[PDB]
Design a protein around this ligand. Sequence first.
Ligand SMILES: O=P(O)(O)O[C@H]1[C@H](OP(=O)(O)O)[C@@H](OP(=O)(O)O)[C@H](OP(=O)(O)O)[C@@H](OP(=O)(O)O)[C@H]1OP(=O)(O)O
Ligand SMILES: O=C(O)Cc1cccc2ccccc12
Lengths: 127, 13, 571
Amino acid sequence: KIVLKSSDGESFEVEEAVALESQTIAHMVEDDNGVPLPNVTSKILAKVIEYCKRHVEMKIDQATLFELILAANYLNIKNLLDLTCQTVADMIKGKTPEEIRTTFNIKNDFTPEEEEEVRRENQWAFE
Amino acid sequence: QVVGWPPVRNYRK
Amino acid sequence: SFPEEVLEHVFSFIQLDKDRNSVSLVCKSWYEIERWCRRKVFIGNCYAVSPATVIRRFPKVRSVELKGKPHFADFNLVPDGWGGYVYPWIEAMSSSYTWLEEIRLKRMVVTDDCLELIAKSFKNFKVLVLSSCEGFSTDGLAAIAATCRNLKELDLRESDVDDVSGHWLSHFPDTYTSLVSLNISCLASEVSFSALERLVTRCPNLKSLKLNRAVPLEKLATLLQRAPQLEELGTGGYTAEVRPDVYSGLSVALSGCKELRCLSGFWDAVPAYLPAVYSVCSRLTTLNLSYATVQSYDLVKLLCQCPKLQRLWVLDYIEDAGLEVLASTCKDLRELRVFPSEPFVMEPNVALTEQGLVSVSMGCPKLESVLYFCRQMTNAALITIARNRPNMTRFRLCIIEPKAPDYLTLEPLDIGFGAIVEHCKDLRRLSLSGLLTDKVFEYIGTYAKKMEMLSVAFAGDSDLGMHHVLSGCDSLRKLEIRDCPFGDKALLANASKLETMRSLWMSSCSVSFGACKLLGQKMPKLNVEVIDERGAPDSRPESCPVERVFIYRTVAGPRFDMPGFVWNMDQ
Ligand SMILES: O=P(O)(O)O[C@H]1[C@H](OP(=O)(O)O)[C@@H](OP(=O)(O)O)[C@H](OP(=O)(O)O)[C@@H](OP(=O)(O)O)[C@H]1OP(=O)(O)O
Ligand SMILES: O=C(O)Cc1cccc2ccccc12
């Protein structure tokens, strides 16, 4: 009873209660062709809908997780944002800065002198 | 005796 | 490539200090996001950093934990006025951390001005824990009571309070209902019982109530009737004329407390009233009988009722016989502390020996933390303990006579403690005593790779002993030493080790003023503090040993609040 259109221009039909799980959709609704969603792909909109259907009633890969969080944030779906953010946090826990920047493909931008000072402060003062 | 031995908080006798 | 608000939200699920620290180091972006959302700060040495530095780095802190004086302060080895003042931290937080909710302090000097400033600065203040603190009075407590409308926890664990008047407790207003935990067990002054009874009645979320000795046993049932939801109870006085009505009133009240898991207090306990507590014992997980002066058989009767016990603190009145019964009945025991009833008499007053500890090590499969005070020990006992409990994580053994050998063989206890460090691979804390040579420190250095805290007294032969520990103990964080023949050589040879540790305390050892000056020169990021009440150290030869030296790494540099008997060895 609500039609959502992905960035791919494909139409998804969902129950009103399912679409209103998104605060973003909720207020585009509180304004019919279909709710266009330029920042959410068909693949990920599908996953978001699965989630919202089930909760109205994460064994995915890294690249899909990163896109799912961005959608949950864009669509303002609080419970989904929590689950995905918890999953990413659990990738952080127990790990060294290097194992982290490895998992997340981040490059260290600290000058050796900067990182030394921060590490000394962390360990000496805050641990 | 020795000061602070045994290592307890008890008042002395 | 997450938006800032998304990373802030990932980080909200990461609350361990070590995880937060590791996050702050992945990249510059994370450094800044992490610091703006860190909720709690744990500062294990108040002089390792300045308040201004903490507040600038972490602007949104809601919970601060600070520790001041080192552990040996507990045994009168740190003179009064050494330091540990929290006022500069409160003064600094008062203008910046408007939303602060929790302050937990340990071994700090806390004044009424500090307490008055907390009350007036922090509107959402919820938790104050003062553990082994000193410097304040009931007047400061009255300011907290009067003003802190959202207070949930007021815990004065083992603090030394100036007991001006019990009237402070009357300052909690009638509109105040938020109390969850109240621990006033260290207060000498009697509070208004009517005020206390009205307070307990109007605080429905009260879960922990630990009284002082001045609440007499005959008034206890009245309070318990008002708080049947209690999970932890510290009794007041536990003595009264022996009467059926008093006993039955106490029995009924205690049996109405279904959620009690922790019991303590028992000052001046009379065996006649201890059975009142039995109905509670089936579910108890912590029992603190440290202040009860009752005899072995009375303790056994109680402990027989406690199959779920996980933590027991008891006096050596338990005896070897009582510990054999404990080993039989408390299969979930994780921690045992046996304190001395007459620590200052040399001849034993109780039949508590090494066998008690052997009994528990054999019978209690989850036993991983022991503090045990006795008058005799053997290597055979220590070896059997080590072999029985390879899961031991904290082992603290105090033989009351300094340098007592194995009483059966007259040998040092080196091999006994060597078995402990060899067999207990996850041992994080050790204190040892008895006759000990450098060889025990060789074992410690070889085997104790997870040991974080070591306490040593009247032990070893030469600097080799301290050198083995500093050289070999990979995980070492705190080392505290008294009355040992350790000095300049081991300290200087291992100077870089000290930057990996919270602190090193050495008192009545052989460390010369000359070595302290050199160590201070060499290691400008250490504060090397000579603490000596004989006046200026250079009024004596450079070779003269100092009374005490306390060494700790710091990013703040020398202290601004040293007394006249403390000197820092920097320039
Ligand atoms: O981690 P630390 O800062 O080194 O703290 C330790 C730890 O206490 P915390 O729970 O505050 O982390 C010990 O707890 P355990 O793991 O040994 O059970 C405690 O020992 P107690 O259990 O006897 O309370 C000990 O305190 P203490 O040194 O007074 O025995 C205390 O060390 P400090 O507070 O002295 O640094
Ligand atoms: O660990 C304890 O508290 C008791 C204790 C046991 C054994 C040796 C000690 C040395 C110094 C301080 C305390 C000590």
